[PDB]
Amino acid sequence: RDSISDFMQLSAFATGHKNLDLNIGSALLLAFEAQKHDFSTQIKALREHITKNNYQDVEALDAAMKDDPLHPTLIQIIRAWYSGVIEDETNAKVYAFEKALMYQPSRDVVVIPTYAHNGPNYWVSEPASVDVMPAF
Amino acid sequence: ISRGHYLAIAADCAACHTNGRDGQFLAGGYAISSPMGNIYSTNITPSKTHGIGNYTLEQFSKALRHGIRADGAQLYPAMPYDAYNRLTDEDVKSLYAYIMTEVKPVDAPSPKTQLPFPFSIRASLGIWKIAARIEGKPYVFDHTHNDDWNRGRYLVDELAHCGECHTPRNFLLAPNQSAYLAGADIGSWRAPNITNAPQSGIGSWSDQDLFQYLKTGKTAHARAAGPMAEAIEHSLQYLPDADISAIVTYLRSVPAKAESGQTVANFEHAGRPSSYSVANANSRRSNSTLTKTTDGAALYEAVCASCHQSDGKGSKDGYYPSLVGNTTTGQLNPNDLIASILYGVDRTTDNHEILMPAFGPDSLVQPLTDEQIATIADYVLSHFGNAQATVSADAVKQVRAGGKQVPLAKLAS
Amino acid sequence: NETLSADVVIIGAGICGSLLAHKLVRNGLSVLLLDAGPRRDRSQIVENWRNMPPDNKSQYDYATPYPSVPWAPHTNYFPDNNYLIVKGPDRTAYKQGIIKGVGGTTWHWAASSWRYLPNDFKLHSTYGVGRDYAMSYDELEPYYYEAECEMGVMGPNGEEITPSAPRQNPWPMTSMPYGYGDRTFTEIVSKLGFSNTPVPQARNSRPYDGRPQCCGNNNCMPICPIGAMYNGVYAAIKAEKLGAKIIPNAVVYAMETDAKNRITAISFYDPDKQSHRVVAKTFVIAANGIETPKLLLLAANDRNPHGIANSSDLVGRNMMDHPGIGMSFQSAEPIWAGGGSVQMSSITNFRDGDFRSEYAATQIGYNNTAQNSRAGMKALSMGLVGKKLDEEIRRRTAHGVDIYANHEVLPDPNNRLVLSKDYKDALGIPHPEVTYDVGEYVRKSAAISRQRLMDIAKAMGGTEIEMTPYFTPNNHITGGTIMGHDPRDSVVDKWLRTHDHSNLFLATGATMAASGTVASTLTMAALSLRAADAILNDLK
Ligand SMILES: Cc1cc2nc3c(=O)[nH]c(=O)nc-3n(C[C@H](O)[C@H](O)[C@H](O)COP(=O)(O)OP(=O)(O)OC[C@H]3O[C@@H](n4cnc5c(N)ncnc54)[C@H](O)[C@@H]3O)c2cc1C
Ligand code: HEC
Ligand code: HEC
Ligand code: HEC
Ligand code: F3S
Incomplete structure (x- = not known):
C-alpha cells in the first residue's frame, strides 16, 4: 500500500495531472517491480529528491535532473502512465486504454478509436483550436 | 388530411x-x-x-x-x-x-x-367473447372532466388501444381490467407499468418527458423499443400534438398500481463507477473466436463499450442512451432489457432511423451465445441500473423461443 | 472425412467465396465453401486490437489482433514470420498482408469499394501498353451494381467529379459528411489544381441490413466494434443460413484430373495433417492473388507436370499491384485527423489520359486514421515532460498528415511467384516467394508523382518531411491468372473458366489482366458473381 500510495503520489507529481486511476497505478507498479527489483528504492529516492529540493512542478525537476541516474526511471514511469506500456516490443502488455494519458489532451475532437464520440455524425462541426488545453 | x-x-x-x-x-x-x-x-x-x-x-x-x-x-x-x-x-x-x-x-x-x-376452428370464439365482457356500449362524453381528459381517454382506450398491451391478460387471455395499465408479457417483450404510480409507473415522469416519449420515443430516461418502436413509428409520430397533450393529461389521471419489489422509479438508479481491466485481455491476445472471455466486464467492453460508454451514460448528444437511470435497465423485470439485447431497437421517426443491432444468434454484428447475454445483462443490471434483478441462461433462451409459454398453448399438443 | 461431395466445390471462404456461396445457395444448389483457417469473432478482434501496444498504432499495423495459425500462415510485416519471401530491386513493393479465416483479409479491410473505367479493360487497345481483358465493363456493370447493393456501399450520388466509371442505377447510400481534414485537403488541393473526390465506402451512413450506422470510430482499420461496414462474414453466415456447408481448417494441397483433364477431386489437410478428399461436379478457386497460383503450382499432376492450367506457362506470372509511396508529415495548419472513417477522400485526376502510353497513371489518396497514438509516441520519443508534453501531443495529433501515391504496373512475365525451395510450414507446403520488378513504366510515373508529392507538401507547408526511397505495398493482389481468348497466352476466359480445365473457374484476385489505378476488390466481387452466373448456366 505504502509503496503503491507513494507510487500514485510520484505519478501525480510527474504527470502533473491529479486525476489518475488507482487500478492502473497498482497494475503499472506491479509490472514495474516485475521488470526491475529495485524500483521501490528508486521511487523513494525520487520522492526524497522532489521533497528536499522542493520542486514545485515536474518541469524544474526534469531540468535539474538531466544527468543524474534517476532521470531514466522518472522518464519511463511517465512513459508508462501516458502510453500505458513499458516495453518497446510489439508483444508488450497493454495495461490501460481509453484512460491512457496521450488520448486525453485530444479527447474532445479526436475520437478514442474503439469508443464512440457524441452521435453518429459529430464530425460535421468545426473542431476546437489547438492552443487551448481542454481538461485533465 | x-x-x-x-x-x-x-x-x-x-x-x-x-x-x-x-x-x-x-x-x-x-x-x-x-x-x-x-x-x-x-x-x-x-x-x-x-x-x-x-x-x-x-x-x-x-x-x-x-x-x-x-x-x-x-x-x-x-x-x-x-x-x-x-x-x-x-x-x-x-x-x-x-x-x-x-x-x-x-x-x-x-x-x-x-x-x-382445438383452435383450428374459429367458431368457439363466441364463448370467449361473452366471457371476456367486451360489449361494449359506444363511447360518450364524460362531463366530469375537461375536454382534453375525454379526448385522451378516447385515444388511449378506443384508438391507440394501450390496454391491448399494457393491461395484463387473465387465464382466458381476456383483458384483466383490475390491473388497469399495469403491464404484461406480450411475447418476447413486456409492456411495463404506465399508471400514475411514482415508482412502478410513469407518475414521476415530467410532462415534457412524456410528451417527447409519445411523439418521438427518445428521451434522456427511456427509449421506445420493440412494440413501442412499431407503435410510435406507425401511429403516434404523425399524430397531432394536441392529442398527445390529451393523452399525457389522461395518463396523469389513471389510478395507481404498484409492482412487487420497487422502491425508486425505474429511471432513478445510480451507476457503479466500475469497469474492466485492460491488462486482462493481454492474456487474451492472439486468441480469436472468443469463448474463454467469460468475465462480465470483458464481454461488456467487447461488445457494448462502443455505444454505451464504459461508465454506462451513453452519448453526449443523446443518440446513444444513458444506460444509467434508464427505465429499460431500471425496470425490475429484465424482459425489456433481455429483448433489447436479443433483438436490438429499430424505430423510424421523421424518416430518421434509430437502430441498435440485435445480439441473438442471427445477428450480423456479433452473434454471441446465450450465456454471454446472461452475463452481460447481469453486469448491466448490477452496475448501471437496477441491481436487484438477475438474468439467467433459461430466461434468455425462453425469450429466444418467443417469450414464456402461456398455459393455454399446452392445449394444442 | 469420406467424400464431402457436392454439386460445386468452391475454395476460399472470404468475401469472394462467401458472396459466391450466397448467390449460389439463393438459387438452390449444393455448395462447399472451404477456407484454410478457423473461425474468429468481431468482439475478440476488437479486444485484441484494444490491448495492442500503441507503438504499432503509430506505424500502421492491422494484423496482430488476428492470430496466425501454423498450418495456414498469413503475412505479418511487423516482426516477420518469413511467410512471403519477396525479391528483386523492388521487393518492398510487394510486402502484401493477408489474414486467413472466416472473412479473410476482408475481415479487416478499409471498405473502399471502387469501379474501374471502361478504358481500364482495353488499355492496349487504348494506349498500346498493358493488356486487354477478355470482356468489357458494360458486361460487368450489373454484377458490379448487385455487389454494391449487397455490401451496402455509400457513394457520391450526384457529382460530376471526374471522367470516371459510368453508372446505370444510383447508389443505395449517400456518402457521410467529411471530417475537418478531408475538407482541408479538398480545398488546399483544389487550390493546387488536384481534383479530390469522396471515396465510396461500404459502410452505413444510415441503418441498413439491420446494422447501425457508422459512429466515426476511425477504426475501420482494422476492425469496427459496431458492424457498420461490410465484411465477408456477412455473406458467409448468410450463405450458411440457407444451408450451404462451410469448413474451417481446410487447407487444399492436391487435385486430380481424369482423361478429359476435368477435375474429379481435390485433397486437403486438416491441422493434424490428415488428408481428406472432396469430389464435386464443379471446381472453382477463390482464394487470393498469391494463394491461388500457389495451389495451382503445388499440386502439379502427371497430366499437368508444370502446374494446373499452366499449359501457356502463365500461372503466377504477370504479377500486378499498385506501386505506392506513402508520406507522413506535420502540417503548418491543424489538420485534425480522426473524424469519421479511415479513408474518405482521394485524388483521381490522374486515373486516365493519353499519357498512359508512356508512363503509369497514379492515385493519390489520404489516410484518415487517427494520429493520436502516433502523436503520443513521437512526443514521448524525445522524453519531453510536463505540460509541454501535452502541448506537443496536441500539436502532433492536430498537425499529422498521411498521404500515399499508388501507380499502375504493366504485365511482366518475369514477375513470378515461385514456390520456395528453402522454407516450409507446419504442413510442409512450400512458402510463397515473389520476384517483383516495378518497370520503367512505373519508374517514369513515380518520377512525376514524386514532384506531385513535393508540391502537395510545399503548398500546404509541412514540416518533418519524410520520404521513403522505395515503393510501399498497396496489397492489391492482381495478376497470375490473366484473362484472354487465346489458351496459349492466358489461363482463363471472359467467364473465368480455365482453358485447360472446362470444369475449373478462377474467381481470384489474380484474375485482373491489369491492376488499374484504384482499389479493385469490388471488381473482384463482380467477377465472383459473374462466375456464379456462369456456374448457374453450366449446372442448369
Ligand atoms: C492493408 C490492406 C489495405 C487494403 N486496402 C484496400 C482498399 O483500400 N481497397 C480495396 O479494394 N482493397 C484493399 N485491400 C485488399 C482487400 O482487403 C483484399 O484484397 C480482399 O479482401 C480480397 O481478398 P480475397 O477475398 O480474395 O481473399 P481472402 O478473403 O482474404 O482469402 C480467402 C480465403 O482463402 C483461403 N485459402 C487460401 N489459400 C488456400 C488454400 N490453398 N487452400 C484452402 N483455402 C485457402 C484462406 O483461408 C482465406 O481465408 C487491402 C488489403 C490490405 C492488406
Ligand atoms: C397508448 C398510446 C400507449 C401508451 C400511452 C403507452 N403504451 Fe406502451 N410499450 C410497449 C412495450 C412492450 C413497452 C416496454 C419497452 C421496454 O421494455 O423497453 C412500452 C413502453 C411504454 C412506456 C414507457 C414506460 C416504461 O416503463 O418504460 C410508456 C409510458 C407506455 N408504453 C405507454 C408496448 C405497447 C403496445 C403493444 C401492442 C401498446 C398498444 C402500447 N404500448 C400502447 C401504449
Ligand atoms: C395487428 C392488430 C390489428 C389492428 C390494430 C387492426 N386489425 Fe383488423 N384484423 C387483425 C387481425 C389479427 C384480424 C383477423 C382476426 C381473426 O381472424 O380472428 C383482423 C381482421 C379484420 C377484419 C375482417 C376482415 C377479414 O377478411 O377477416 C376487418 C374488417 C378489420 N380487421 C378491420 C380493421 C380496422 C378498420 C382497423 C382499424 C385500423 C383494424 N382492423 C385494426 C389485426 C388488426
Ligand atoms: C451503436 C450500436 C449499439 C450497440 C452495439 C449497443 N447499443 Fe444499446 N442502444 C443503441 C442505441 C442507438 C439505442 C437507442 C436507440 C435510439 O435512441 O434511437 C440503444 C438502446 C439500448 C437499450 C434500450 C434503451 C431503451 O430505453 O429501450 C438497452 C437496454 C441498451 N441499449 C443496452 C445495450 C447493451 C447491454 C449493449 C451491449 C451488449 C448494447 N446496448 C449495444 C446503440 C447500441
Ligand atoms: S470503426 Fe465503425 S463506427 Fe464507423 S468509422 Fe469504421 S465503421
Missing part, C-alpha cells in the same frame, strides 16, 4: 395490416405471434374479389367492433376489437369512407392462418 385517414393513423390499423416495408400497405398477411401460433392479418383494401370491397357499413362495423366477418365467422382477439368496440358511429363510418375511398385495391390473397387444434 381526411378525418378517416387520421382516425386510421391514430388507431394504428396500418401497422398490423402491413407486412413490413414491402407487402403493399393494408393488404394484411402480417403474422402476429399469438400464444396459439401465427395469426395472419387479413387484407383490408376494398378489392371486389379478394378484398373487403363487398363489405357494407353494418358488416364493417360488426367486424370492427364485435368481430364477425361477412360470412359470419368470428375474428380472433388478435384484432383489438375488444377496445375497438367503443368508437362512435361517426368514427366507424369515417373509417369506412377512408377504406373504400382512399386506399387502392390490391389483388393478392393474404396467407390463411392455420391454427392448431
Whole structure:
C-alpha cells in the first residue's frame, strides 16, 4: 500500500495531472517491480529528491535532473502512465486504454478509436483550436 | 388530411395490416405471434374479389367492433376489437369512407392462418367473447372532466388501444381490467407499468418527458423499443400534438398500481463507477473466436463499450442512451432489457432511423451465445441500473423461443 | 472425412467465396465453401486490437489482433514470420498482408469499394501498353451494381467529379459528411489544381441490413466494434443460413484430373495433417492473388507436370499491384485527423489520359486514421515532460498528415511467384516467394508523382518531411491468372473458366489482366458473381 500510495503520489507529481486511476497505478507498479527489483528504492529516492529540493512542478525537476541516474526511471514511469506500456516490443502488455494519458489532451475532437464520440455524425462541426488545453 | 385517414393513423390499423416495408400497405398477411401460433392479418383494401370491397357499413362495423366477418365467422382477439368496440358511429363510418375511398385495391390473397387444434376452428370464439365482457356500449362524453381528459381517454382506450398491451391478460387471455395499465408479457417483450404510480409507473415522469416519449420515443430516461418502436413509428409520430397533450393529461389521471419489489422509479438508479481491466485481455491476445472471455466486464467492453460508454451514460448528444437511470435497465423485470439485447431497437421517426443491432444468434454484428447475454445483462443490471434483478441462461433462451409459454398453448399438443 | 461431395466445390471462404456461396445457395444448389483457417469473432478482434501496444498504432499495423495459425500462415510485416519471401530491386513493393479465416483479409479491410473505367479493360487497345481483358465493363456493370447493393456501399450520388466509371442505377447510400481534414485537403488541393473526390465506402451512413450506422470510430482499420461496414462474414453466415456447408481448417494441397483433364477431386489437410478428399461436379478457386497460383503450382499432376492450367506457362506470372509511396508529415495548419472513417477522400485526376502510353497513371489518396497514438509516441520519443508534453501531443495529433501515391504496373512475365525451395510450414507446403520488378513504366510515373508529392507538401507547408526511397505495398493482389481468348497466352476466359480445365473457374484476385489505378476488390466481387452466373448456366 505504502509503496503503491507513494507510487500514485510520484505519478501525480510527474504527470502533473491529479486525476489518475488507482487500478492502473497498482497494475503499472506491479509490472514495474516485475521488470526491475529495485524500483521501490528508486521511487523513494525520487520522492526524497522532489521533497528536499522542493520542486514545485515536474518541469524544474526534469531540468535539474538531466544527468543524474534517476532521470531514466522518472522518464519511463511517465512513459508508462501516458502510453500505458513499458516495453518497446510489439508483444508488450497493454495495461490501460481509453484512460491512457496521450488520448486525453485530444479527447474532445479526436475520437478514442474503439469508443464512440457524441452521435453518429459529430464530425460535421468545426473542431476546437489547438492552443487551448481542454481538461485533465 | 381526411378525418378517416387520421382516425386510421391514430388507431394504428396500418401497422398490423402491413407486412413490413414491402407487402403493399393494408393488404394484411402480417403474422402476429399469438400464444396459439401465427395469426395472419387479413387484407383490408376494398378489392371486389379478394378484398373487403363487398363489405357494407353494418358488416364493417360488426367486424370492427364485435368481430364477425361477412360470412359470419368470428375474428380472433388478435384484432383489438375488444377496445375497438367503443368508437362512435361517426368514427366507424369515417373509417369506412377512408377504406373504400382512399386506399387502392390490391389483388393478392393474404396467407390463411392455420391454427392448431382445438383452435383450428374459429367458431368457439363466441364463448370467449361473452366471457371476456367486451360489449361494449359506444363511447360518450364524460362531463366530469375537461375536454382534453375525454379526448385522451378516447385515444388511449378506443384508438391507440394501450390496454391491448399494457393491461395484463387473465387465464382466458381476456383483458384483466383490475390491473388497469399495469403491464404484461406480450411475447418476447413486456409492456411495463404506465399508471400514475411514482415508482412502478410513469407518475414521476415530467410532462415534457412524456410528451417527447409519445411523439418521438427518445428521451434522456427511456427509449421506445420493440412494440413501442412499431407503435410510435406507425401511429403516434404523425399524430397531432394536441392529442398527445390529451393523452399525457389522461395518463396523469389513471389510478395507481404498484409492482412487487420497487422502491425508486425505474429511471432513478445510480451507476457503479466500475469497469474492466485492460491488462486482462493481454492474456487474451492472439486468441480469436472468443469463448474463454467469460468475465462480465470483458464481454461488456467487447461488445457494448462502443455505444454505451464504459461508465454506462451513453452519448453526449443523446443518440446513444444513458444506460444509467434508464427505465429499460431500471425496470425490475429484465424482459425489456433481455429483448433489447436479443433483438436490438429499430424505430423510424421523421424518416430518421434509430437502430441498435440485435445480439441473438442471427445477428450480423456479433452473434454471441446465450450465456454471454446472461452475463452481460447481469453486469448491466448490477452496475448501471437496477441491481436487484438477475438474468439467467433459461430466461434468455425462453425469450429466444418467443417469450414464456402461456398455459393455454399446452392445449394444442 | 469420406467424400464431402457436392454439386460445386468452391475454395476460399472470404468475401469472394462467401458472396459466391450466397448467390449460389439463393438459387438452390449444393455448395462447399472451404477456407484454410478457423473461425474468429468481431468482439475478440476488437479486444485484441484494444490491448495492442500503441507503438504499432503509430506505424500502421492491422494484423496482430488476428492470430496466425501454423498450418495456414498469413503475412505479418511487423516482426516477420518469413511467410512471403519477396525479391528483386523492388521487393518492398510487394510486402502484401493477408489474414486467413472466416472473412479473410476482408475481415479487416478499409471498405473502399471502387469501379474501374471502361478504358481500364482495353488499355492496349487504348494506349498500346498493358493488356486487354477478355470482356468489357458494360458486361460487368450489373454484377458490379448487385455487389454494391449487397455490401451496402455509400457513394457520391450526384457529382460530376471526374471522367470516371459510368453508372446505370444510383447508389443505395449517400456518402457521410467529411471530417475537418478531408475538407482541408479538398480545398488546399483544389487550390493546387488536384481534383479530390469522396471515396465510396461500404459502410452505413444510415441503418441498413439491420446494422447501425457508422459512429466515426476511425477504426475501420482494422476492425469496427459496431458492424457498420461490410465484411465477408456477412455473406458467409448468410450463405450458411440457407444451408450451404462451410469448413474451417481446410487447407487444399492436391487435385486430380481424369482423361478429359476435368477435375474429379481435390485433397486437403486438416491441422493434424490428415488428408481428406472432396469430389464435386464443379471446381472453382477463390482464394487470393498469391494463394491461388500457389495451389495451382503445388499440386502439379502427371497430366499437368508444370502446374494446373499452366499449359501457356502463365500461372503466377504477370504479377500486378499498385506501386505506392506513402508520406507522413506535420502540417503548418491543424489538420485534425480522426473524424469519421479511415479513408474518405482521394485524388483521381490522374486515373486516365493519353499519357498512359508512356508512363503509369497514379492515385493519390489520404489516410484518415487517427494520429493520436502516433502523436503520443513521437512526443514521448524525445522524453519531453510536463505540460509541454501535452502541448506537443496536441500539436502532433492536430498537425499529422498521411498521404500515399499508388501507380499502375504493366504485365511482366518475369514477375513470378515461385514456390520456395528453402522454407516450409507446419504442413510442409512450400512458402510463397515473389520476384517483383516495378518497370520503367512505373519508374517514369513515380518520377512525376514524386514532384506531385513535393508540391502537395510545399503548398500546404509541412514540416518533418519524410520520404521513403522505395515503393510501399498497396496489397492489391492482381495478376497470375490473366484473362484472354487465346489458351496459349492466358489461363482463363471472359467467364473465368480455365482453358485447360472446362470444369475449373478462377474467381481470384489474380484474375485482373491489369491492376488499374484504384482499389479493385469490388471488381473482384463482380467477377465472383459473374462466375456464379456462369456456374448457374453450366449446372442448369
Ligand atoms: C492493408 C490492406 C489495405 C487494403 N486496402 C484496400 C482498399 O483500400 N481497397 C480495396 O479494394 N482493397 C484493399 N485491400 C485488399 C482487400 O482487403 C483484399 O484484397 C480482399 O479482401 C480480397 O481478398 P480475397 O477475398 O480474395 O481473399 P481472402 O478473403 O482474404 O482469402 C480467402 C480465403 O482463402 C483461403 N485459402 C487460401 N489459400 C488456400 C488454400 N490453398 N487452400 C484452402 N483455402 C485457402 C484462406 O483461408 C482465406 O481465408 C487491402 C488489403 C490490405 C492488406
Ligand atoms: C397508448 C398510446 C400507449 C401508451 C400511452 C403507452 N403504451 Fe406502451 N410499450 C410497449 C412495450 C412492450 C413497452 C416496454 C419497452 C421496454 O421494455 O423497453 C412500452 C413502453 C411504454 C412506456 C414507457 C414506460 C416504461 O416503463 O418504460 C410508456 C409510458 C407506455 N408504453 C405507454 C408496448 C405497447 C403496445 C403493444 C401492442 C401498446 C398498444 C402500447 N404500448 C400502447 C401504449
Ligand atoms: C395487428 C392488430 C390489428 C389492428 C390494430 C387492426 N386489425 Fe383488423 N384484423 C387483425 C387481425 C389479427 C384480424 C383477423 C382476426 C381473426 O381472424 O380472428 C383482423 C381482421 C379484420 C377484419 C375482417 C376482415 C377479414 O377478411 O377477416 C376487418 C374488417 C378489420 N380487421 C378491420 C380493421 C380496422 C378498420 C382497423 C382499424 C385500423 C383494424 N382492423 C385494426 C389485426 C388488426
Ligand atoms: C451503436 C450500436 C449499439 C450497440 C452495439 C449497443 N447499443 Fe444499446 N442502444 C443503441 C442505441 C442507438 C439505442 C437507442 C436507440 C435510439 O435512441 O434511437 C440503444 C438502446 C439500448 C437499450 C434500450 C434503451 C431503451 O430505453 O429501450 C438497452 C437496454 C441498451 N441499449 C443496452 C445495450 C447493451 C447491454 C449493449 C451491449 C451488449 C448494447 N446496448 C449495444 C446503440 C447500441
Ligand atoms: S470503426 Fe465503425 S463506427 Fe464507423 S468509422 Fe469504421 S465503421
